[PDB]
Scaffold this active site. Sequence first.
Site, PDB file in Angstrom:
ATOM      1  N   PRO A   1      34.738 -53.546 -11.165  1.00  9.80           N
ATOM      2  CA  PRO A   1      34.863 -52.445 -12.132  1.00  9.80           C
ATOM      3  C   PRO A   1      33.569 -51.674 -12.247  1.00  9.80           C
ATOM      4  O   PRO A   1      32.533 -52.142 -11.787  1.00  9.80           O
ATOM      5  CB  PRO A   1      35.103 -53.152 -13.460  1.00  9.80           C
ATOM      6  CG  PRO A   1      34.654 -54.542 -13.261  1.00  9.80           C
ATOM      7  CD  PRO A   1      34.913 -54.860 -11.812  1.00  9.80           C
ATOM      8  N   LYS A  33      35.794 -60.846 -14.118  1.00 12.24           N
ATOM      9  CA  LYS A  33      35.666 -60.620 -12.691  1.00 12.24           C
ATOM     10  C   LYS A  33      34.252 -61.019 -12.305  1.00 12.24           C
ATOM     11  O   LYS A  33      33.329 -60.879 -13.120  1.00 12.24           O
ATOM     12  CB  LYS A  33      35.919 -59.141 -12.339  1.00 12.24           C
ATOM     13  CG  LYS A  33      37.432 -58.818 -12.273  1.00 12.24           C
ATOM     14  CD  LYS A  33      37.727 -57.364 -11.898  1.00 12.24           C
ATOM     15  CE  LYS A  33      39.153 -56.966 -12.311  1.00 12.24           C
ATOM     16  NZ  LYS A  33      39.712 -55.845 -11.483  1.00 12.24           N
TER      17      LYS A  33
END
Lengths: 114, 115, 122
Positions: A1, A33
Amino acid sequence: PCLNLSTNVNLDGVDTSSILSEASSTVAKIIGKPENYVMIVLKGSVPMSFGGTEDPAAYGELVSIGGLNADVNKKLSAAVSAILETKLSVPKSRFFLKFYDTKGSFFGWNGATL
Amino acid sequence: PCLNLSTNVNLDGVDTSSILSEASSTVAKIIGKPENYVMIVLKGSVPMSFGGTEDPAAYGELVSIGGLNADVNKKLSAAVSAILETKLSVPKSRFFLKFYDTKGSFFGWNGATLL
Amino acid sequence: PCLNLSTNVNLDGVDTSSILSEASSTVAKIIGKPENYVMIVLKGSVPMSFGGTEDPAAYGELVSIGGLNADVNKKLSAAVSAILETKLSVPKSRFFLKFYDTKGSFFGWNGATLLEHHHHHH
């Protein structure tokens, strides 16, 4: 991201590396993540107005392939706003953060897409 | 809402505060939200090409929780483009403005979201 | 379309106009858009980290009125990443590119919008 930030605060004397590093690990932990895939962008000295005044403010956008929803977005907003309050003196009332959930086929990385 | 602008025009010598103030009130009136909730971001001296040339140009994005439609967007484009023409000499034919409508759960403010 | 890019590389040290021109041609040819409607924006010297390090990196977004799909996006990712590798020394593994297909009525140009009168095409 990717968390992509702009602020009117001047960063010429600031340890920007520490701000990036804290944002990077904080985003990784909350969105879930690995930090290997987290990008942070921080533009300073950007002219801004919010609510009609030029006091310190910030605008961010956070883009992720999934992993974004009301709870995660609330937690990311709280955590990122705390970094900007402590490290840039940008009050959370003067921070807007747009979230975007992208399809992987519409996100390029490593010369390909996801 | 937020209007986020970039231009290749140099803001030095330009009255940047008057551009911010005019844009702020214009967005508030057309989108119909209190100016308290209007953010304007303006970066100058940004390398850019439009149509293959580097004459004055600008790129903007306007993000809002509802209030956007073809009619509102046309009015916002006309009004903001007039500011850039008069204050920066950016022709409206060299100004792109992407409009984005967001859900409140996908817009953070005050350490939470607008849900 | 608009390709909007940020990098931590210092553009004082590179021919920035050649990057703009090559990106402009590349986007026109791969999407298939008149170059008259192609905008490229490139900001440099921007503090960035990717994977926790500050080695050269870049973040981009490409918005277009149609013309985007999984296959075109892969080609654009490859081609744009190759420009940044060769001209900015940004490894493609440190370049993220968001793609967005907009309706014309949500894309201002010329003081109005590009409200579409025919069908939208990927």
